[PDB]
């Protein structure tokens, strides 16, 4: 957890976490992938467009379990 780094982890650690999440959901162990997705969403700080974009790059059951695993209100 970078815990609000200024600029480095906002771009680097976010990319690392999002790509680990991508290969985790690709291999079938998508719960850790969703955890990495949430971490990268928090780290980047502008998840607005991704809120739609990452919404349309996954099967609907992944969307359902993600919205259950997204208590970011």
């Amino acid at each position: 957890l970078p815990d609000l780094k200024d600029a480095e982890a906002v771009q680097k650690f976010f990319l690392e976490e999002i790509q680990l999440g991508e290969e985790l959901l690709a291999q079938g162990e998508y719960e850790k992938g969703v955890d990495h997705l949430t971490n990268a969403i928090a780290v980047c700080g502008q998840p607005q467009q991704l809120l739609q974009v990452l919404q349309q790059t996954l099967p609907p059951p992944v969307f359902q379990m993600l919205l259950t695993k997204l208590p970011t209100i």
Binding site: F14, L15, I18, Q19, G21, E22, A40, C44, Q46, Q49, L50, V53, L54, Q56, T57
Partner: protein, 627 residues
């Protein structure tokens, strides 16, 4: 931002759509256009992110590039399926080449161009036919695909599909009211390409849908090409359609037997005899009014066997293997003709068999006839010329003489084909200029191998004089290599490549006798290359001096006795003595040097700069530039 663009391209190419979206956080649209224009020579080839998104086969990536974002499908690309690096390759063309039904479906559905034109003006439909997917061709054609557009060789998509075994693609494309009579400027009538790999069902499909048999530009019927390609079933189907024309089926069976006689892929000699027996029986079936094979001269390469006029001759030669091979070659010559390419290839193979059984006397004549046909047709004969160099090398190695007329004729044809190669080099601008240059290099190497062969024989007097005449003609041509060398440079060199076959037995450049004949034949002894070196400068850069002491003596004494200024002083300010790299070479040069007053004066005024522009004669200016 080359790093960010490389990251985006890697994400698109590897299908990393999630990291692509990660790279798509609130980026500037100008940088998005920069990503779009990131052709950036990845892989040494033209490609945009959308092109590689169609290439790899990730539908989600394509969806993120243009379902949600902006990117054009029309970019300069590269296909390289068979070396076809073609500019202007769009996303649709590559996608149809790769057979991605989902990607092509999305690309057509959103509204991209479906009839895109490239440098070779090939539609994605033709690439789909090359791959052979029924669904892709279906979806393209129902979404307004024009079938009339063909290659730069006017190669119709039907022809490309029929070249492979895609019978479903062929049958659908003709079900789309395409005519099979699309004659390319090459000569193909959409069924010759079907009769290449024995695609029997495609041939049947064209026969059903009004094949309309058409002779090519080579003068060969589709049935003749089917017989030449040694595929019997397509010969059957073409024989059982439209016009039987008993002469045509008789010559077809003759051609089929002849092709089976002397082809490496099919060597069923008993089948050759049986098909020729069928042809003879059809020739002698009706009794009266039987058409007879015309009389051809007994070409000496095939022997004095004047064809097979009567079935008694065929019965006599039933078990005669070499007679059957010669009869097959003669039937090839009579039916297939002596002008087209397809008559050349079998002949060498038969001689090749005679090359392996050490029966060289027939092999040389047969191969020389093949070369003469190739030179008459003005084809590419460098491979055959290298073959003759190899077989002469093996003949000399196995203590066997080489006849003077054979080496004289191969030298004549080598000189003529070198003339043609030089013409192709200085005439073909950019399409095949490098291929022609490499042909020139190989031909020069082969000619020097043949000259070495000619020197290393028990040659006659007048035919060796003819050999010298031909070599003098080629020297008067003044050939130059890509490295600007002359033939003298290669003859005295050790870096001149030697063919990996039996040529290594005798091609031991630098050879004394090759150089001897080269300069006594008359040549530009001071032909300084573009790198600045001379023949003496070549021989002083020689790392194996003692092993060829007599030949090295001979070449130095020959060069000194005929020109070859021993103080050349190349453009790199190096006298030939200082590049000796061997005590033997410098000692021989010093003993072979001569007292030259206005050459040591030239050395004195070279480093000590004295003006020479019109103060000395302009011939002396050429001497100074020589220095």
């Amino acid at each position: 931002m080359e790093g960010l663009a490389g990251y985006v391209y890697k994400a698109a190419s590897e299908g990393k759509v999630l990291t692509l979206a990660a790279l798509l956080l609130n980026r500037s649209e100008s940088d998005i256009r920069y990503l779009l224009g990131y052709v950036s020579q990845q892989g040494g080839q033209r490609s945009t992110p959308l092109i590689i998104a169609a290439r790899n086969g990730h539908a989600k990536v394509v969806r993120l590039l243009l379902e949600h974002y902006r990117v054009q499908t029309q970019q300069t690309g590269t296909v390289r399926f068979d070396g076809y690096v073609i500019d202007g390759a769009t996303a649709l063309w590559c996608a149809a080449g790769a057979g991605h039904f989902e990607v092509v479906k999305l690309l057509v559905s959103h509204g991209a161009n479906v009839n895109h034109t490239t440098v070779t003006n090939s539609t994605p439909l033709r690439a789909a036919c090359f791959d052979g997917r029924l669904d892709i061709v279906k979806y393209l054609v129902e979404n307004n695909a024009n079938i009339s557009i063909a290659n730069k060789y006017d190669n119709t998509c039907l022809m490309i599909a029929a070249y492979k075994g895609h019978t479903d693609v062929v049958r659908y494309l003709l079900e789309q009211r395409a005519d099979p009579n699309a004659k390319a400027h090459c000569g193909a009538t959409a069924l010759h390409f079907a009769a290449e790999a024995g695609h029997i069902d495609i041939v049947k499909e064209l026969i059903k849908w009004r094949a309309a048999i058409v002779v090519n530009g080579h003068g060969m019927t589709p049935l003749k090409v089917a017989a030449e390609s040694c595929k019997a079933d397509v010969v059957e189907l073409l024989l059982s359609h439209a016009d039987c024309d008993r002469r045509s089926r008789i010559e077809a069976l003759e051609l089929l037997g002849a092709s089976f006689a002397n082809d490496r892929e099919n060597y069923d000699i008993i089948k050759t005899y049986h098909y020729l027996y069928l042809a003879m029986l059809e020739r002698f079936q009706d009794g009266d009014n039987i058409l007879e094979k015309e009389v051809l001269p007994p070409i000496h390469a095939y022997g004095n066997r004047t064809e097979c006029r009567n079935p008694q001759e065929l019965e006599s030669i039933r078990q005669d293997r070499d007679a059957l091979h010669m009869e097959g070659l003669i039937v090839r010559e009579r039916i297939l003709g002596a002008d087209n390419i397809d008559v050349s290839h079998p002949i060498i193979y038969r001689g090749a068999v005679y090359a392996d059984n050490m029966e060289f006397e027939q092999c040389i004549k047969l191969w020389l006839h093949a070369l003469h046909l190739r030179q008459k047709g003005n084809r590419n004969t460098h491979k055959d010329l290298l073959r003759f160099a190899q077989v002469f090398s093996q003949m000399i190695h196995l203590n066997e003489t080489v006849k003077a007329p054979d080496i004289e004729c191969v030298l004549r044809c080598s000189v003529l084909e070198i003339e043609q190669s030089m013409n192709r080099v200085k005439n073909i601008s950019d399409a095949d200029v490098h291929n022609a240059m490499d042909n020139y290099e190989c031909n020069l190497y082969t000619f020097l191998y043949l000259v070495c062969i000619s020197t290393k024989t028990q040659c006659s007097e007048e035919d060796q004089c003819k050999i010298n005449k031909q070599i003098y003609n080629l020297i008067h041509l003044d050939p130059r290599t890509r490295e600007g060398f002359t033939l003298l440079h290669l003859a005295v060199n050790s870096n001149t490549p030697v063919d990996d076959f039996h040529t290594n037995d005798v091609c031991s450049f630098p050879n004394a006798l090759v150089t001897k004949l080269l300069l006594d034949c008359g040549a530009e002894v001071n032909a300084v290359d573009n790198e600045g070196n001379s023949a003496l400068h070549i021989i002083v850069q020689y790392n194996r001096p003692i092993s060829d002491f007599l030949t090295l003596h001979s070449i130095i004494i020959s060069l000194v006795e005929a020109g070859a200024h021993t103080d050349m002083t190349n453009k790199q300010n190096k006298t030939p003595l200082d590049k000796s790299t061997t005590g033997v070479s410098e000692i021989l040069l010093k003993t072979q040097m001569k007292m030259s007053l206005k050459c040591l004066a030239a050395r004195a005024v070279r480093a000590n700069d004295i003006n020479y522009q019109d103060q000395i004669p302009r011939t002396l200016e050429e001497f100074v530039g020589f220095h």
